[PDB]
Amino acid sequence: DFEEIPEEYL
Amino acid sequence: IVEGSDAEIGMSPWQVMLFRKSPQELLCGASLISDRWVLTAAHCLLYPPWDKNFTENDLLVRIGKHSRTRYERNIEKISMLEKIYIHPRYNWRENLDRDIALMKLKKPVAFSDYIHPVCLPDRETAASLLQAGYKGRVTGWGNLKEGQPSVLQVVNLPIVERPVCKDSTRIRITDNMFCAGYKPDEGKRGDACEGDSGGPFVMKSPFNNRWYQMGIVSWGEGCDRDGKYGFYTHVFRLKKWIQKVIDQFG
Amino acid sequence: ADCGLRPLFEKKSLEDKTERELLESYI
Ligand SMILES: CC[C@@H](N)C(=O)N1CCC[C@H]1C(=O)NCc1ccc(C(=N)N)cc1
Ligand code: NA
Ligand code: NA
Structure with a gap:
């Protein structure tokens, strides 16, 4: 449902 | 709402979204009270009847948001948790008395038009x-x-x-x-x-x-x-x- | 020190569309 976020934050 | x-x-602009990393989803709201302290409800983080017990590494803080689901490029800021503090007498067993927790961010957040305590x-x-x-x-x-x-x-x-x-x-x-x-x-x-x-x-x-x-x-x-x-x-x-x-x- | 003063509203002396409802309840 949510737009994926920049990998740096994961 | x-x-x-x-x-x-x-x-x-103090509105904070507590965000679960996996699977990626809203966890709760929260608020910015300084450039590195975020306030929320204890039950967002700890609620044993529903087997809820989040650790720092389980979560992200998204600050500056408007849109719920979208990634708001050049506007929101996403921060990692250094440490959670839950009230020691938070009463999850009975009535959620003292339903409050603090979160310390790994790094200070930069204030902006959309981010302010x-x-x-x-x-x-x-x-x-x-x-x-x-x-x-x-x-x-x-x-x-x-x-x-x-x-x-x-x-x-x-x-x-x-x-x-x-x-x-x-x-x-x-x-x-x-x-x-x-x-x-x-x-x-x-x-x-x-x-x-x-x-x-x-x-x-x-x-x-x-x-x-x-x-x-x-x-x-x-x-x-x-x-x-x-x-x-x-x-x-x-x-x-x-x-x-x-x-x-x- | 600057807490609670929003950049796009109080800092610019602009009001949001419903804050007057709160003011009017502070009786
Ligand atoms: C005691 C009532 C139960 N429905 C409840 O609200 N619980 C069970 C433990 C967690 C808390 C909750 O779900 N909080 C979220 C919530 C629910 C309702 C409202 C409201 N204002 N209607 C706000 C937050
Ligand atoms: Na009601
Ligand atoms: Na009663």
């Missing part, structure tokens, strides 16, 4: 503003009814007298809570709801024209039910704990 409206851009009340602002009939403002990305909004929702709601709060529920109410919401005969309606948890109840002081966070979205029986009211953690009542944490852990 049920029966609220879309927020204006920059209207609640809210104030916490002192005794005098609290005594002056927490009065039955006085309205505050609740914001969040939670359910639209007892469904999910495209953008931040806002609703203004009057504080309710303590006897009316008590008479509206079988749950035991404490001095660390207040309730808010319209009565059935007042016609208007609105309420926080699931997913709004941990978000702020704010009031704009007429003395210095600043926004203060008086409450934290904590619990309610259903959402926007006639004769029921939303219940909020009483931030001023727990400020000693807040200052202690912030003082000992900076």
Whole structure:
């Protein structure tokens, strides 16, 4: 449902 | 938020989204109180009846948001948790008494037009503003009814007298809570709801024209039910704990 | 120190569309 976020934050 | 409206851009720049990393989803609301401290409800993080027990590495803080689901490039800021602090006498076993937790960020966040901390009340602002009939403002990305909004929702709601709060529920109410919401005969309606948890109840002081966070979205029986009211953690009542944490852990 | 003053509203002396409802309840 949510737009994926920049990998740096994961 | 049920029966609220879309927020204006920059209207609640202390609004924080607690975000679960895997699977990627909203966990709760929260609020920015300094460039590295975020305030929320303890039940967002710890609630053993539902097997909820989040660790720092389980979560991210997204600050500056408007859109619920979208990644807001060049506008939101996403921060990692250094440490969670939950009130030591938070009462998850019975009534969610002292439903409050702090989160310390790994790195300070940069303030912007969309990111800015809210104030916490002192005794005098609290005594002056927490009065039955006085309205505050609740914001969040939670359910639209007892469904999910495209953008931040806002609703203004009057504080309710303590006897009316008590008479509206079988749950035991404490001095660390207040309730808010319209009565059935007042016609208007609105309420926080699931997913709004941990978000702020704010009031704009007429003395210095600043926004203060008086409450934290904590619990309610259903959402926007006639004769029921939303219940909020009483931030001023727990400020000693807040200052202690912030003082000992900076 | 600057808490509670929003950049796009109080800092610019702009009001949001419903804050007057709160002011009017502070009786
Ligand atoms: C005691 C009532 C129960 N429905 C509840 O609210 N709980 C069970 C423990 C967690 C908490 C919750 O779900 N909080 C989220 C919530 C629910 C309702 C409202 C409202 N104002 N209607 C706000 C937050
Ligand atoms: Na009762
Ligand atoms: Na109600």
